[PDB]
Structure formats: structure tokens, C-alpha cells
Amino acid sequence: AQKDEEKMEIQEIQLKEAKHIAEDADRKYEEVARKLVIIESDLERAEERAELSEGKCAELEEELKTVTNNLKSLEAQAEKYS
Amino acid sequence: AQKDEEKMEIQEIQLKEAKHIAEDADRKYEEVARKLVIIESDLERAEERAELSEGKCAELEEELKTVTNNLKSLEAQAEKYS
Amino acid sequence: DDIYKAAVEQLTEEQKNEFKAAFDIFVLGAEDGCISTKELGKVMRMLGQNPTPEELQEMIDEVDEDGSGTVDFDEFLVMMVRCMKDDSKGKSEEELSDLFRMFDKNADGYIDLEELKIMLQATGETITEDDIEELMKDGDKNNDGRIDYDEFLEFMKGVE
Amino acid sequence: DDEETTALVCDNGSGLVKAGFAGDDAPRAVFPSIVGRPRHQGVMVGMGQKDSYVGDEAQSKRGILTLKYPIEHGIITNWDDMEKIWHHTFYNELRVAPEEHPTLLTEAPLNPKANREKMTQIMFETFNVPAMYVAIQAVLSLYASGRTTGIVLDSGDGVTHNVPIYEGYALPHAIMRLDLAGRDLTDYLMKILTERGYSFVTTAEREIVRDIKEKLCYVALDFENEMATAASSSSLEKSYELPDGQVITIGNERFRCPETLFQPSFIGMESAGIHETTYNSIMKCDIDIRKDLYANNVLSGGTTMYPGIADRMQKEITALAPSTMKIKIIAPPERKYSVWIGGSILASLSTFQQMWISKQEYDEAGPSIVHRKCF
Amino acid sequence: DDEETTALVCDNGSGLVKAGFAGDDAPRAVFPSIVGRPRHQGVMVGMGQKDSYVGDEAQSKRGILTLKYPIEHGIITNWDDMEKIWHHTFYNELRVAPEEHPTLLTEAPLNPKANREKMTQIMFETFNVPAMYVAIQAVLSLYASGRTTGIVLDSGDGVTHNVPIYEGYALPHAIMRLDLAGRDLTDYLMKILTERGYSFVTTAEREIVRDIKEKLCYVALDFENEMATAASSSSLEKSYELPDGQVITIGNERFRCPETLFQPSFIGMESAGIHETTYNSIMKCDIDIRKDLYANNVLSGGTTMYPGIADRMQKEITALAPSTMKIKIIAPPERKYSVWIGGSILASLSTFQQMWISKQEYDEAGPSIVHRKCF
Amino acid sequence: ISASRKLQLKTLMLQIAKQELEREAEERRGEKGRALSTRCQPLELAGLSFAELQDLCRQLHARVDKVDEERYDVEAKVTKNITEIADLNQKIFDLRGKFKRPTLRRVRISADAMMQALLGARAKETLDLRAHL
Amino acid sequence: GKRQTEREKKKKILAERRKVLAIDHLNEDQLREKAKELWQSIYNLEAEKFDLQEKFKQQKYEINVLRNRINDNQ
Ligand SMILES: Nc1ncnc2c1ncn2[C@@H]1O[C@H](COP(=O)(O)OP(=O)(O)O)[C@@H](O)[C@H]1O
Ligand SMILES: Nc1ncnc2c1ncn2[C@@H]1O[C@H](COP(=O)(O)OP(=O)(O)O)[C@@H](O)[C@H]1O
Ligand SMILES: [Mg+2]
Ligand SMILES: [Mg+2]
């Protein structure tokens, strides 16, 4: 019975240490979750703004093409009327 | 002595649960570490490429302005020709 | 501001019990006499409940601006306020709406950079590297030179 | 709390009953849904032996019981046992009489009508609730993610169903319900463990095989490479201690059990995996909302908790989908209770407060009221 | 601005509603005129789902709506929807109450009387404007060109009409109104796309086909040579990315869709193309103003924006017309908004300020006032 | 880049903005007092019979009724503005703010703080059942 | 919208506040007191209406910023 009491108290201090380790892990978990949420939100915004920029670039490119071609044709016609 | 032994068994199961907590915490934490790093790298790249597109779009704006002016000139020439 | 109101509201049934328990548990003395002026960190370690890190950082920094290194009973109440979630919780959104209206008293449809410039001129705060940098980051959130309402709306959100 | 009246958000499920009051973060009581009569004779007198242990009590005395689930595939096959489970849930795990609380059950899509009608008849006659409402298990999981669009794959333990939703308008013609789920994976794992010598037969040992599946199995990113690696090295063999000793070593059974999800030909099912029924469910939708569904694919349910599934599924869909669309798979850490969290949110809404099936309405139209406007 | 009172130059059109205050260069708000009720059931509660999305809002939620234009061919077939469109235009796109602003609607030539009378009755009773005036859509397009003579071909999206005008005196016996327009070209393009495998059926996918038509189609200078070239080489095949991927390649469908304008036999219409109804409209005029009409042919309306139409039409008319006359086709770059620019100019005139139909006049003679002196 | 300086500048800007808002509120109170002062009618009560008193009362009541009518019209206009603002707010909510429900709830009450009590009670029940024999 | 019902409601509310007095239901001093009471009520109403006008100005601010944001969406 004496030996068993010894083992009981040893396991008792071990259990307290275990609980503390558990709480520390819990706090770390909450922290990392917060960080991940923030960074993912930033990812959303970054992707969306990239898309906006790409679309606008496309539209401006097309308009440039059209107007340039019209100008070239009218230049040819100016020479013709000369 | 029997009561003490029962106490010991209880402590044993609790220690088991604590180690279980430790392992699951570590696993989830490593997972979130992986996700964090991947998200961060991709966010960096996306911001870079979006800014690149923005610069190209501004250049396109200037090009379009040049073309518009030249078309105005050619149109005036053609109408006077008429 | 809300800090004084929080210090006054420290006197309650729950936080008083927390303060009494902390005093009875890990405020006794009988140390080696090192003069542990940094016992606020010891209280944080013995708390068992870690609050938002902003509260702890502000408690460490903003108090004893004179460097006294000594804490009064009123400072005990302030620390216990920092323990629980006694924050104003980002003030009132009505305050943010009224601030945005006062900024748009000229009816510009958004907070122009002139508004922040004149407010900074009135307050006289030293123009550091973060000065103007923050204004350009928030106003040009789209990085296109246009300042939208949501930019400073969310910028002023989440703080008191 | 105090005055006022809170709603009971029960969620029958199939394998774990999750319940709790509306407005919280997690279910109050989660316990397996098994009812096991004793099977041996019993010689001690006055031991106080009951005739049926339900819930979590029968997971501790399972050595001398014959556990039998009352819900096979979403549908309920044994109404007396289900009534017993509900009675236990209300009175012993929550300790709130149902006479003073609205209830919000959940039901899989495309289930038989008679099941739903019997459920409402029981809730109104036996337990005598004030008002109950039945909701589809996928809309709640979409609530919990805080979205309003997206196609949700809710791979529970009974049945896997895939409900696409856009802007709050569900698409009833694009629901693809498949009956492969966690239970079939447990049976297949129990069947392939026999290739090493371990034989589990008793209905009690199915629980041990379920624990093995939960703790060890994972979904391989690429199946053939893993099959080749596990056949040469020995870096995968993880051991596990049975409830009595005699540790066992699981080799390439680790990623072969959950691979059945993506190749249902393993258990003889004809249909395509969960990686291709999602793409088919998307392609049945209109041509203009496919980008949003591609970008907001949501995972839920217990069985989607395998380590490494959110990458395998994304790789598969990216292989199937057009190269331009962005494929994103939302896998919140609170996957298991996603349906119940969504149920709590829905029950806590003010706009929803007039959709309950009030008892006087049931008295006027009978149990067939559930199919009517109050859905 | 300030005191004083500005006029609202609305322009109903058929396909795009263009509006804005009088005296500017471009319409303030341009948005499609479609009203689409949702068609699916809707399961999310409290999402704030409206019963009808109008204007540009229904071009973003078109995946779950059934868009339906309220104006078929110039005439208005669904008065409630048109009233809804007007209410949206006044209150949300311009944010000016109609109680303090005159309005200047536009109407195609040769339209039913009841349409015009109902339009004025609505504007005076529901919106309660101070004074409204209805003008023919071609005279405005002639205003915008700064001319005072010329024959204007206003090929809108609903109806193509060809009003000749000389020295400010319109010739009512020479108006040739033809009902082929942009909508029929969209339907014909949607019908010939099926020859490659692409099937668009839903009323939402008509918008996608319209976008294809706008961005890719062009009018061929010579039809047979283009048909021969597209059948040998592959220099014409331009690709286009659908709203979900799966790029498509348009071959000789590019110049076959807008060719219907010059050969209305493609869609089964009997009449002659827009190249020959202009010549017929000229030949009905007197013998002494034909040279001026030949020299001042004006193009307007959206559908005349196809790349290469101002040359095909000139070639065709030069083929038809006598060899001595000079054929000139005025095609301003601001073709689409030409009618609205002309409307702004007309509303900004001082001489026109006493032609409005004042409300007291309507109260004395009823809605039939519009056919009277105040035209 | 300087987090400490960023926080200091944000706090000083918030405080000075609050002071300016309070100054604006005081200005508004002064303007309201001026409006109340200038809205009074200069009236005389010397050498007027009770018939004139009743006539003045009826005239003042008519003016009060006109002011009330104008106030009700402005209240209706502001109510319409409030309705359209709420419409825009729900538009923003469905565009972006759909995540309000997983924010409006109660968490960390007993499940996150009282969890070992179940195991303790189970062990105590097992011990009591053992001691029953 | 539906100005007839709005007009009817406004007229009904005004008729509710039709504080018409009789001949021998008050005194001359009482009549002056009633006039001053109406004056004070009108002044409180004017303060409330000025606050309402400021709130409507802020509503206009919100309207323009919200329409700007919605246009910025596209
Ligand atoms: N951590 C886990 N890893 C792998 N599988 C799991 C895990 N947790 C639960 N499961 C599987 O999911 C099932 C529980 O699913 P659940 O979502 O409770 O079903 P229901 O929809 O009926 O509630 C269990 O039978 C188990 O097989
Ligand atoms: N850039 C373009 N190229 C070809 N077709 C166009 C273009 N823009 C518009 N259209 C066609 O013209 C129609 C719009 O015509 P519009 O002038 O707005 O009609 P309305 O007279 O009713 O205003 C659209 O339906 C489209 O089919
Ligand atoms: Mg489930
Ligand atoms: Mg037109």
C-alpha cells in the first residue's frame, strides 16, 4: 500500500503537468487559427484585385487594337485622296 | 491498498488522455503551419502579378490617348479633303 | 476615454472575486527580496487565462509612463480590468458613423486626404515614416488613387 | 438565460446523435446512436440489469451486447428503437422536457416521404413538442460556413449527398445522392484487414474497426505511387493496440480503406467517386453559375475528416474542370459539427421564427403537413 | 447648376434604356431593359430575396432568373414591367423625383396609337411629371449629326426604320419601317451556332450569344468571296471564352449572322435588305431632292456598329444608284447614343420650350392630346 | 513600418477626432438654440379683447398645424431614406456580410471550460457501483 | 408611391392635432398659457426636426457613399 501511494502521488503530479501542457496547446491552437483566418482573407482580396486589373488590361488592349486599325485605314484613304 | 490502486488506475487513464491530447495538438499545428506557408507564398505571388498587370494597363491608357489624338487629326484631314 | 470607465467598472462581483483569488494565491511575498517590480508578467503567468495580447501589451506599455516600477491599488484594479474582457469592444459603431459624417461634412462622398491632413495638422503629431504611409495605404487600398468609404470604414472598425 | 423560450436543435444523423440548445457553438451531448439488448443469460440476481442500453452507455458494456443502429442509410428502419433514442436524448442527455421547446430535426435529401411523416407524427404525439421543423442537412452546412452560394458535399456516415446552391436558390434538379459513406468504409476496412490475419466479426468489434479507421487511415494524394511505396519500404506501417493487447500493424490498408470514396468499384458499387459526382452535379447547373460553384466548393460531414482529402479532391476536380476556372475547397476545422452549428444559426434567426409547424396546424391537416408550404 | 429646371431626356429603346439630364454629352445611366423573376424555390431564409430584379442587377443574377424584355418590336407588350422599368430608371439610376422634371420620351415611327397614349397616361398619372413630349427616334438622330437634311437609317435592336428628311420637312409618305433588328440577328446567330455543337437555349444564354455577336461578328464587304475564303483557309476562326471556360471557335458564322441585314431571306423574311429599302425610300421622294439625300445618308442606332458596314452599304447603294450621283454614308463614332444626344440637343433648345404637353392641357383633353397639335 | 508609432498616431487621431466631433456637437446645440430663439413670433397682448385673443389663438393653432404638417412630411421623407438605406445595407450584407450568423451566437460557456467533470462523475459512478457489492 | 393614402394619413394626423378650443372652456390667462404651451411644443418640435434634418443629411452621405461603393463593385 505504501508503494502504491508513492505511485499515486507521482502520477498525480504527472497529471497536473499534463493539464498544463494541454492548456498551452489549446492557446497555441486558437492563436494559429486567428492567423490563418487573417491571411486567407488577404488572399481573397489579393486574388480579386488581380482579376479586376487583368480584365481592365484586356479591355484597354482591345480598344487600342480597334482604334489603331481604323486610324491606319483612314491614313491609307488620306493618301488615296491626295 | 485497494483504494490506492484504484486511484493509480485512474491516474494512468488520465495520463493516457493527456498524451493523446499532445499528439493531436501537434498534428493539427503542423497542418496549419503548412497551410500558412502555402497561403503566404501564393499571396505574395498574386500581389506581384496584379501590380504588373496594373502597370501594363497604365501603359495601355497612354497608348490609347496617342491613338485617339492621331485619329482626330486624320479625321480633320479627310473632311477637309471632302 | 473608456479606460477610466473600465477602471471604475472593475468593481463588480466576478472581477473582485478574481482579484481576491489572485491575491490569496500568488500575492504573498516571502521571496528572496529581489524587488520583483515586473510581477505583472508573473500575474499573467499565474492567471491561467491569457487575454487578447493587445490588452497585455497596452498594460505593460501605457502604465507607469514615468517608469515608476511600482503599482498602486488603483493599478491593481487596472490590471484586473486587463485580465477580464472589460474592453469597450471597439467603442460604438455610431461613433464611427458620426466620425465619417464629420469628415464628410463637405459632402465629398468619402474621406478625402485633405481631411486626414488637416486633422493631423490640428493634432500636431510628428510626421514619422508611418505618417502619410498609412494614409496612402488606406486611401489607395485599391492602389488606384481613389478613396472609397469601405476602406476607412473597415480601417476604423475593430478598434476603440 | 431565463424567460423566453429556446429551441432544441436535434440532429439525428446516422452514427452520432448531436443535440443542443439553439445559439451555442457546439452540441451539448454527442453520443453514438446504438441500442443494444443483452444476449447472454445473466446469473447475478438483483444486479439491476436493464433490457436495453442506449447511447454512450452501450459503448462501455458492448462486450455482452448486440449493438444495432436504428438508422441504416438516412432512412429509419426500426421506429421503436429510434423513439427510444429520442427519449434518451431529451430526458437524460439534456434533461429538458419536450413540452416546452421547439425542435429542429434534420433529414437527408431525397429520402422517403413516410420517414419524414412518421418523424413528425412521433414528435407531435409521443413527445408532444410545441412545434417542429425539418431541414435538409446540406443547407445548414452552408449556413455554418457563412456563405450564401456554393456546392456542399456532406459525406456523413449513412449517406453522401451533394446539394448545389446559388444565391440562396437551391437547384432541385442537381442533387446527386450517393449511398457510400462511413459505414461502408468501416465494413470494407474490416474486410481487408482479414488479409493479414485479423478477423473481426462480432457487431461489437465493428466499433474497434471504426476506431482503427478513425485513428490511422488517411487519403493518399496519388494512389499508385502510394501503392508502390508501401510495397517496397516499411515507413507506413503504423501499429495500434487492441482493447486487450496484441498490437496489430496496418500496412497499405491505411490508404486503401478511404480510397473507396474515389473508386466505389472497390466495394462493387457502380457509381463514380465523390470526386466526379461533384463535377457532374456542377455540370447540371446553368452555364453562368458554374464559376461561383467551382470557387466555393464546401466540405462537411464526419467522413470528410480524413487527413489529406482536401488536397486529393482539389487535384481531381482540377483535372476534370476547365483549366481557367479556379478550384477552391472550403474545409473548416469544425467539419464534424458543421451541420449542427448551421442548425443553431438557423434556429436563432428572427426571420425564421414564423416557419415552425405549429401544433394547431398539424391538428388541422394531419402529418402530411410537412410536405406542404411549411417544408 | 442650381435654380431653374432641367429636363429628363429618357429614351426607352428596346434592349438598352438610355437616360440623362438634358444638355450633356452622354446618357447618365445605360442599362439593359429586362425584368426577371426568380424561377427556382429558394431555401435560405432571410437572404433578402426580392421578387423581381430589373435593369443591370438582373444581368448579374441571370443564372437563376428568367429575363423577359418588356418591349418586343418598338411596341410595349407588358405594361406593368415597363412601369417597373421606368420607376427604377427615375428613382435609382438618376435619383430625381419626376414631380419636378419634364420628360422627353422617344418612339419609333408607325407605331400603334394605343402604345403612345398609354405611355403619356402613365407618365401623367403614375409618375405625375409636369410635362412630357414624345418625339420620333429618327429626327433626333438627325439633330445629333448637326445636319438639317438627309435620310437616316436607325437600325436599333427592336425595329429598323428609315425616315427621309429634307430642309426640316419630313416626308411622311416615304418612311419604310422594317422589323428586322438586333434581336432577330441574335436569334439567328443562336440558331446557326448549333451547326458546330454549341446549343444555347435558356433565356439567360441569349445574353451570352448577344455578347458573342457584339464582340466577334462583322459585316463582309463581299459575301461570296468571304464564304469561299472561310471554307479553304482558317484565318477567320476566332475563339471566345464562355462564362465558365470551354472556349468556342466561330468560323464562317462571323459574317453570316450580320449578313441577314442585307438578305432578310435568311430568317425567312420576304422584304429586301437595309441596302435596298434605303434606295426605295429615296426613290419615293421627289425628283429634285434625291441628290441631297444621296449625299447625306446617315447611319444611327446600335446595330449599325458592325465593323465594315459603312463600306458594304455604300458599295450596295452605289451599285443601285445612278452612276453620276455621289453616295456618302455618315457614320459618326458615337452611333449608339446618337438618338439620345439629339434628344438632349432638342430639349436644350429655347424655341422648343413651348411645345411640351403641359399637364393642364392633358386634364382638358385626355390622353388623346398626343395626336393633336402637340405631336 | 513603426508599429508603436502607428498605434500612437492612430490613438492621437482618434482622440483629436473625438474632440472635433464634440466641438461639432456643441456647435449644433448652439445652432439649435439659435433656431429656437429666432422661431418665436413677436406678439403683443396690450389692448386686445378676448375675441382678439381667440382669433390670435386660432391663427397660432393654424401655424402650429402647418408646422406639424411640414414636420410629418419631412418625417415621411426621412423614413423613406431610412428604408432605402436599410435596403442598401442588406445589399451589402448579401454581397459580403453573409457571415453574421456564425458571429451572432454564444460560445465558450461550459463546453470549453467544464469538460473533465463528465469523466470524474463517470469514475465516481463506477467506484460507487463497485462498492455497492 | 400612392400619394393618396399618404395625404389621407397626414390629414388625419393634422385633424388629431386640430386643437380647436371652445368659448367658456378656458380663461384669457389660461388662453395665454395655452399659447405659450403651443409655442414651447413647437420649439421642441423644431429642435427635433433640425436633428431630423441633420440625420437626413447623414442619410444622404450614406446614400452617396453606398451608391459609389456599389458602382465600384463592377
Ligand atoms: N476524425 C475522423 N477521421 C475519420 N473518420 C471519422 C472521424 N470522425 C468521424 N469519422 C467517421 O464519420 C462518422 C461520423 O459521421 P457523422 O458526421 O457523425 O455522421 P452523421 O451525419 O450521421 O452525424 C463515423 O462513423 C466515422 O466513421
Ligand atoms: N458594338 C456593337 N457591335 C455590334 N452590335 C451591337 C454593338 N452594340 C450594340 N449592338 C447591338 O445593338 C443592340 C442595342 O441597340 P440600341 O441602339 O441600344 O437599341 P435601342 O434603339 O433600343 O436603344 C444590342 O442588342 C446589340 O445586339
Ligand atoms: Mg450529417
Ligand atoms: Mg434606338
TrEMBL record, chains D, E:
UniProt xrefs under InterPro entries: Actin, Actin/actin-like_CS, Actin_CS, ATPase_NBD
PROSITE patterns in the record: ACTINS_1 (PS00406), ACTINS_2 (PS00432), ACTINS_ACT_LIKE (PS01132)
Top-level division of the source organism's lineage: Eukaryota
Family: Belongs to the actin family.
GO biological process: actin filament organization; actin-myosin filament sliding; heart contraction; mesenchyme migration; positive regulation of gene expression
Residues involved in ADP 2 binding: 14, 18, 157, 302, 305, 336
Keywords on record: ATP-binding, Cytoplasm, Cytoskeleton, Methylation, Nucleotide-binding, Oxidation
Entry-linked CDD domains: ASKHA_NBD_actin
One Pfam family named in its UniProt record: Actin
Name of the protein in question: Actin alpha cardiac muscle 1
GO molecular function terms attached to this record: ATP binding; myosin binding
GO cellular-component term (any): sarcomere
Binding positions for ADP 1 per the UniProt entry: 14, 18, 157, 213, 302, 336
Automatic annotation (TrEMBL), chain G:
Segments of skewed composition (Basic and acidic residues): 1-12
Stretches that traverse the bilayer: none
Job description of the protein: Troponin T is the tropomyosin-binding subunit of troponin, the thin filament regulatory complex which confers calcium-sensitivity to striated muscle actomyosin ATPase activity.
Protein family membership: Belongs to the troponin T family.
Protein name, per record: Troponin T, cardiac muscle
Organism: Sus scrofa
Annotated gene: TNNT2
